[PDB]
Write an enzyme that holds these catalytic residues in place. Sequence first.
Site, mmCIF file in Angstrom:
data_model
loop_
_atom_site.group_PDB
_atom_site.id
_atom_site.type_symbol
_atom_site.label_atom_id
_atom_site.label_comp_id
_atom_site.label_asym_id
_atom_site.label_seq_id
_atom_site.Cartn_x
_atom_site.Cartn_y
_atom_site.Cartn_z
ATOM 1 N N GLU B 766 0.752 -0.937 0.096
ATOM 2 C CA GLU B 766 -0.080 -0.189 0.008
ATOM 3 C C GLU B 766 0.798 1.374 -0.026
ATOM 4 O O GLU B 766 0.707 2.266 -0.647
ATOM 5 C CB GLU B 766 -0.921 0.095 1.133
ATOM 6 C CG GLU B 766 -1.699 1.248 1.202
ATOM 7 C CD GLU B 766 -3.032 1.021 2.255
ATOM 8 O OE1 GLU B 766 -3.636 2.339 2.430
ATOM 9 O OE2 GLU B 766 -3.521 0.205 2.558
ATOM 10 N N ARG B 844 -8.914 2.506 12.967
ATOM 11 C CA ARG B 844 -9.600 1.355 12.765
ATOM 12 C C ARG B 844 -9.896 0.442 13.939
ATOM 13 O O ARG B 844 -10.938 -0.250 14.239
ATOM 14 C CB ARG B 844 -9.125 0.826 11.476
ATOM 15 C CG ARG B 844 -10.137 -0.452 11.038
ATOM 16 C CD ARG B 844 -9.706 -0.924 9.628
ATOM 17 N NE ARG B 844 -10.161 0.050 8.600
ATOM 18 C CZ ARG B 844 -11.398 -0.128 8.200
ATOM 19 N NH1 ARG B 844 -12.374 -0.992 8.590
ATOM 20 N NH2 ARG B 844 -11.684 0.850 7.019
ATOM 21 N N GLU B 1225 -11.058 -8.133 3.506
ATOM 22 C CA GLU B 1225 -10.594 -8.135 4.874
ATOM 23 C C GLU B 1225 -11.531 -8.494 5.896
ATOM 24 O O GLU B 1225 -11.148 -9.219 6.758
ATOM 25 C CB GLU B 1225 -10.231 -6.641 5.328
ATOM 26 C CG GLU B 1225 -9.063 -5.873 4.486
ATOM 27 C CD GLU B 1225 -8.961 -4.495 4.738
ATOM 28 O OE1 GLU B 1225 -9.958 -3.705 4.352
ATOM 29 O OE2 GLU B 1225 -8.125 -3.935 5.535
HETATM 30 N N1 MTE Z 1 -5.125 -12.960 -3.264
HETATM 31 C C1 MTE Z 1 -5.131 -11.939 -2.717
HETATM 32 N N2 MTE Z 1 -6.364 -11.341 -1.945
HETATM 33 C C2 MTE Z 1 -6.214 -10.191 -1.394
HETATM 34 C C3 MTE Z 1 -5.157 -9.469 -1.121
HETATM 35 C C4 MTE Z 1 -4.172 -10.039 -1.935
HETATM 36 O O1 MTE Z 1 -3.081 -9.368 -1.940
HETATM 37 N N3 MTE Z 1 -4.109 -11.035 -2.883
HETATM 38 N N4 MTE Z 1 -5.116 -8.280 -0.499
HETATM 39 C C5 MTE Z 1 -6.358 -8.227 0.540
HETATM 40 C C6 MTE Z 1 -6.295 -6.722 1.167
HETATM 41 S S1 MTE Z 1 -5.487 -6.124 2.266
HETATM 42 C C7 MTE Z 1 -7.317 -5.969 0.599
HETATM 43 S S2 MTE Z 1 -7.579 -4.274 1.180
HETATM 44 C C8 MTE Z 1 -8.345 -6.434 -0.673
HETATM 45 C C9 MTE Z 1 -7.772 -5.272 -1.519
HETATM 46 O O2 MTE Z 1 -8.739 -5.653 -2.823
HETATM 47 P P1 MTE Z 1 -10.396 -5.372 -2.932
HETATM 48 O O3 MTE Z 1 -10.546 -3.684 -2.336
HETATM 49 O O4 MTE Z 1 -10.556 -5.248 -4.458
HETATM 50 O O5 MTE Z 1 -11.037 -6.345 -1.890
HETATM 51 O O6 MTE Z 1 -8.066 -7.550 -1.014
HETATM 52 C C10 MTE Z 1 -7.588 -8.609 -0.015
HETATM 53 N N5 MTE Z 1 -7.619 -9.939 -0.644
HETATM 54 O O1 URC Z 2 -9.321 2.589 6.418
HETATM 55 C C1 URC Z 2 -8.444 2.041 6.009
HETATM 56 N N1 URC Z 2 -7.260 2.645 5.194
HETATM 57 C C2 URC Z 2 -6.368 2.119 4.331
HETATM 58 O O2 URC Z 2 -5.502 2.716 3.942
HETATM 59 C C3 URC Z 2 -6.359 0.694 4.401
HETATM 60 N N2 URC Z 2 -5.547 -0.247 3.807
HETATM 61 C C4 URC Z 2 -6.286 -1.793 4.063
HETATM 62 O O3 URC Z 2 -6.740 -2.507 3.215
HETATM 63 N N3 URC Z 2 -7.312 -1.492 4.997
HETATM 64 C C5 URC Z 2 -7.368 0.058 4.904
HETATM 65 N N4 URC Z 2 -8.390 0.710 5.819
#
Ligand code: MTE
Ligand code: URC
EC number: 1.17.1.4
Lengths: 99, 1291, 50
Positions: B766, B844, B1225
């Site tokens: 990120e 959070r 998440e």
């Molecule tokens: N396969 C896979 N799934 C994953 C991730 C990933 O890196 N690989 N990251 C996770 C995280 S930390 C987040 S915030 C979300 C981001 O994608 P979205 O916003 O499309 O769910 O995917 C989740 N699922």
């Molecule tokens: O409130 C959030 N900010 C982020 O920058 C971040 N990154 C992660 O998936 N979760 C969140 N949630």
Amino acid sequence: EMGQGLHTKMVQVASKALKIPISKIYISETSTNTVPNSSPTAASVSTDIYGQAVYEACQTILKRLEPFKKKNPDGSWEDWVMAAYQDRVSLSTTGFYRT
Amino acid sequence: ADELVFFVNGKKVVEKNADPETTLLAYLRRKLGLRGTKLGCGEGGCGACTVMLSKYDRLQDKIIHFSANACLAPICTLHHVAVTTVEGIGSTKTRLHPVQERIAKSHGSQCGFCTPGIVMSMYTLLRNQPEPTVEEIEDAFQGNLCRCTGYRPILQGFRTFAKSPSLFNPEEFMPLDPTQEPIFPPELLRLKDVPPKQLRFEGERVTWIQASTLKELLDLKAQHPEAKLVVGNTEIGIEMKFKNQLFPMIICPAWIPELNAVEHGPEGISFGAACALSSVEKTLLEAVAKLPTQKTEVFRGVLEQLRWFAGKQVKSVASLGGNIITASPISDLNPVFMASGTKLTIVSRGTRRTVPMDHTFFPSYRKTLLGPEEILLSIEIPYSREDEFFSAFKQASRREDDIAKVTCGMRVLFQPGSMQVKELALCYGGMADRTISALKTTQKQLSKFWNEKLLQDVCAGLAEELSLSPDAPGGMIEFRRTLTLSFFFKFYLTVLKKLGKLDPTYTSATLLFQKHPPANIQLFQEVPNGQSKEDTVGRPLPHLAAAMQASGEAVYCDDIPRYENELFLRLVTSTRAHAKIKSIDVSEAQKVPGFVCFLSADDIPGSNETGLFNDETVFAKDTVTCVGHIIGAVVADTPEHAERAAHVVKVTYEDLPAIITIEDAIKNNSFYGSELKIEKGDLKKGFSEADNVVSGELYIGGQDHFYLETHCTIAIPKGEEGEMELFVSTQNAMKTQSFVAKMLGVPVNRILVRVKRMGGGFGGKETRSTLVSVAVALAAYKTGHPVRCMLDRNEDMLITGGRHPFLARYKVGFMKTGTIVALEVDHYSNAGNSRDLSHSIMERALFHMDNCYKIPNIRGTGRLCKTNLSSNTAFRGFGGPQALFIAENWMSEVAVTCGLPAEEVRWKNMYKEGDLTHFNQRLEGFSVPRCWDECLKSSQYYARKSEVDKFNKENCWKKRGLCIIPTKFGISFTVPFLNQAGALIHVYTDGSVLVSHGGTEMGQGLHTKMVQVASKALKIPISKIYISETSTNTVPNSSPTAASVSTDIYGQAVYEACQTILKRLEPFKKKNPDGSWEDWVMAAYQDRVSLSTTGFYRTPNLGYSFETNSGNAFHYFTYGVACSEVEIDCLTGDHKNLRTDIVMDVGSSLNPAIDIGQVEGAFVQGLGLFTLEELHYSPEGSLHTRGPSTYKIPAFGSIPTEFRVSLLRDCPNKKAIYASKAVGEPPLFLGASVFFAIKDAIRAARAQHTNNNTKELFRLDSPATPEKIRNACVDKFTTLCVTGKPWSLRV
Amino acid sequence: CDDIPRYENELFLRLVTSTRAHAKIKSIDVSEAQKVPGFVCFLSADDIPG
Ligand SMILES: Nc1nc2c(c(=O)[nH]1)N[C@H]1C(S)=C(S)[C@@H](COP(=O)(O)O)O[C@H]1N2
Ligand SMILES: O=c1[nH]c(=O)c2[nH]c(=O)[nH]c2[nH]1
Ligand SMILES: Cc1cc2nc3c(=O)[nH]c(=O)nc-3n(C[C@H](O)[C@H](O)[C@H](O)COP(=O)(O)OP(=O)(O)OC[C@H]3O[C@@H](n4cnc5c(N)ncnc54)[C@H](O)[C@@H]3O)c2cc1C
Ligand SMILES: NC(=O)C1=CN([C@@H]2O[C@H](COP(=O)(O)OP(=O)(O)OC[C@H]3O[C@@H](n4cnc5c(N)ncnc54)[C@H](O)[C@@H]3O)[C@@H](O)[C@H]2O)C=CC1
Ligand SMILES: O=c1[nH]c(=O)c2[nH]c(=O)[nH]c2[nH]1
Ligand code: FES
Ligand code: FES
Ligand SMILES: [Ca+2]
């Protein structure tokens, strides 16, 4: 760009339309994933037609920044751009022209 | 000698100048251009580099096939070997192999980075056994890791090789046909005939001699006593790569028949020292099948250690003698060979001896008694005699592929027909700097009889003789001592059973680990009956790239070809936690061949000030503030040269006082910013009203992302106006772009960042990816050449930060009914050496301290601790899991205190539809009660609780636990301005559509979902729509792909761009209503109507204020419930995950295959966070755990054996795109159901041997590793072992 | 265009063109071409996948 100064003119046009100096504006290249279905750069009309498309995109950007400009009339271009961004206003747009 | 000749995918390779230091992985990727085989770790743990090898075995008279880690295989061992990589078996340009088709169609590929190595592990199994059993299929992957999928779909897809709507259909799967497989190269088969000759290869630094005969070997050893033998390289590979050893001469004796001979003699089975552990295992399995039980006691101890050892890849190349001579203190084999007196035949030119292995064979750390001209020729593992019994035990952090904490071989020989000890040997690894025998203890028992008094005396003797000082390497002092006694106890009981050929409550302690068969059920909602086939929203469409991931065609950053003039960067980083940099000397680095330059803070043309909060340097100047703090970077012509030169850059430091732990920080007032707080109601009043008040402290450890693809940037300098184009593995192209610009001092419009995909991000890409991107950009700017850097795993774990460890102090007031009335929690996170995302992470956490419970008087605070550690960052959950865990912990304590069943206490405290949270947000469409009720029922929770009590009554040394927990997770970025999303859509004149949006693909199936959305919206098939990548020149100013909202927000922006297109097309549609999409698009084009537009979305009605405690923090919440059951081994700390049932509310899923995969993947990351994964730091703040050997994420064998997931039916969410909900998440916290199941089991163990106090509250921190579980199972053995004869004692 | 650095695996193409204003093509023999060091392949109408 093939030597005729099209990007230069487009930058002059954008800078006049947005009322900012040319130094804040850049053209890197032409590509089919940024502007699709383009006519060939030909018939001497490129300044005319891309100049309008660029001018139309600049007008749209100006409309979008205009409330921020009014809130902060003594602020900079940089201030209004950042305010629009923090307000979740899109700073991206297309422009189009049809003779 | 000079030429090396092998085959790759059937094609002949002639390497005229083989360098002995070149691995197969490097060769495939950099010389042959075959980038489907990946680097994941470089140390044999992840299996991303797995390939198959085939050769003619002269000696068995057949072509054999086996798997191997290309990252550890020297090309110089491969003369006349045929290699098969993922590209050798199939592709999307020709046809997928069945292995590739099935892993792709069964949703077993998400990011795809592990997929080729798992495909090759399954392919190898099939070439050996075209019809495997289910058990063979699980065992095929002991050396493969996957961070995304949670393993279930891979196993379930591949189980079709053995013997609700559905997520896939095995009836469409092509059966395997062995007659269509590639033929063993006929040229190799002709060469099998010619007798081998000694070969010599010469590299930059190393000479390698491939010895063809024993005599050659013995002469080379006389001529060159300093020469290092290499057989499988699985130890020397590590020494060379990680411990900076250089062995200028290597002799590889692997060809020599005497070192490969297997001989069945009257005393035992003899193996050549070069025989692979898999051959050992095979031959001994056959012996155990054919011979009387009484003869194979030692063999079964060997087999038991090989079960939990390494993957097939390592076992197929790791030699038996390699393990013996490496002589690690934690070898699992040497204690077995020592306790059994296994016979070592040791030779020298003209000398030859056979000695039993005994305590003297290991004089000191990692040395044996061989002299410098001797080699180990063979090892005879003995037959067991009458009256002779043997056990081997091993306990690590994880069952599969892990380093023993303690490991042992135990043998007893009685007088004939008696219980009278004649010989006793108890030999342990993990208790000294070498394999040791407990001679003092065992000596005392000779002539004693096997009885209670002997057990007591051996325990007391072990407690005394196997002491560990407080400072023993490996730590875990109490656990280790306790295991030495616990293993003796299992031995003692096992030997009693074997002698009575007693007490049904004790018998399970004697039982060897046994796999129950898997059962997996996925339940989701069918799409409406008449929904168009072309509308795939709500259907289980496989990830669009899964087939290319399975084939090795999907291109990740380092797979992009290098330019001919492209250079390589290696970071130089602090070795001190906090110090002034006195000087830097690059004079040795300048001498490494290919050195280009060393870069440091003075080279930066723009700003050295970087980081989300501008509190970081790009390159440290004057001071370092953590181990891993980036000081500079070397650029060289190859990655090996860059790494070698970086290693020899010499920094001189002067230490400063370091603040490492959360405790150091509190004591020193060392914080970022001030206290965060949410408070509602009246605490004094609530406490004064509470019947019962519990207070405590709780800790949860951090977590390394372990994305299978580590951080990676390629930076291309364009040479004009400061322009640079970067290909980067990042979830945040926007900050990459602006941080690279700020460092260069150029406008942001100069910098183009492109992200095709990541092999995992999980939050760790990120922001922290910029540490690598900004250094590589500097190098490209300074040299004017393309430059790249991909981190090795050990750099990544040290430098790029992880989840935040949390310490909590809490106080909860409740009534005797279990109703919560007051709660105070003070949170502290360990933030490391910059702010980064720590503040929003604490926010959070505070937002989630209620979990699913209504609490009228509540005060939560949070502080960010400022420490001399790498800065910690976003990790899936983002503060929510820590806070939710603290909440379930006090809740579990509330239930115990009240003596009420926990599910009753949870249910009675649960919010109801319409309640306000502690931050005053209303819960609308609160579906936890439905998830809760349906999970209770479908898990058979109640019936299962009685079964667990029964098991516990009937087992004294194993206990079961069961726990059902809810969760809710708020959906939105907590920073309001981040909740915006743009898209750009073009329709070309053939009617094909190119969609671009600000989100990135990291395996979660975002692009898949975006194509599904655009196809529904436009009413065209998905085949007409394509997403190539994410770039800052198509969508600018994007938020990072994070907070689980990407589908919600990019889905809206994509939707809107489609609406605009539909409006531009409508007149043409009206004119020609029976025409095709293609007709309308062409007519719009010919009419000079634009077929390009942007789309944009900003989430409405968001804006929480901490000052007023009002305003919506989130757009809505995602919900779910999980019930898990475990069985723990109270004597070792091991446990099984028996069963888990999850019910998840994801609204109307856009893609239930992808959403269930996200549920299972998140759940398993949670499970690792709470039960397996632990990072260890020296007291000076240097990370010990820097690869998969010591950092243990869930393995294939880690998942619940019965694993059921249901998506809640009929719960449209009107707040998001096509009624769906964010999924990425929210499910991760549900893995805490395993942690609380474990704690339930521990309470049953403690009732059994520790206490009568059934309202006792014992502290269990996370992770609940074998260490924490065993230490909590307080009993007669722990009592003998807990640390801490004085002349006087008060009283 | 040609100032763009080449990739390390980047190959070079040379067109083969007609020496006749109007004729049937009877055969094409690449057997001498194939002997020039570094030859990778000759392409013609039949290689076209679309
Ligand atoms: N396969 C896979 N799934 C994953 C991730 C990933 O890196 N690989 N990251 C996770 C995280 S930390 C987040 S915030 C979300 C981001 O994608 P979205 O916003 O499309 O769910 O995917 C989740 N699922
Ligand atoms: O409130 C959030 N900010 C982020 O920058 C971040 N990154 C992660 O998936 N979760 C969140 N949630
Ligand atoms: C992923 C992974 C997991 C592992 N898991 C475990 C585990 O669970 N338990 C465990 O005990 N070990 C484990 N190991 C260690 C492993 O068993 C040893 O690495 C392996 O057996 C060494 O054999 P090799 O042929 O690869 O040795 P090499 O690395 O080639 O040689 C190792 C050492 O032995 C010497 N040597 C080799 N042959 C002879 C000879 N005949 N005479 C004299 N010296 C010789 C070499 O000179 C060198 O010093 C693991 C290793 C990896 C990579
Ligand atoms: N890579 C992998 O995944 C696996 C590797 N193997 C083996 O694990 C080995 C690990 O090597 P290293 O990490 O270098 O560990 P090492 O060989 O130095 O051994 C460390 C262990 O030895 C003990 N120890 C060492 N000195 C001690 C002392 N003075 N007092 C008390 N105890 C002491 C402790 O048990 C400590 O945990 C590998 O080399 C390999 O042989 C086994 C399982 C998995
Ligand atoms: O009418 C024109 N069409 C073209 O395609 C072309 N190209 C050139 O400059 N002149 C013109 N004029
Ligand atoms: S890269 Fe070879 S095992 Fe991980
Ligand atoms: S799909 Fe296995 S690591 Fe991502
Ligand atoms: Ca931080």
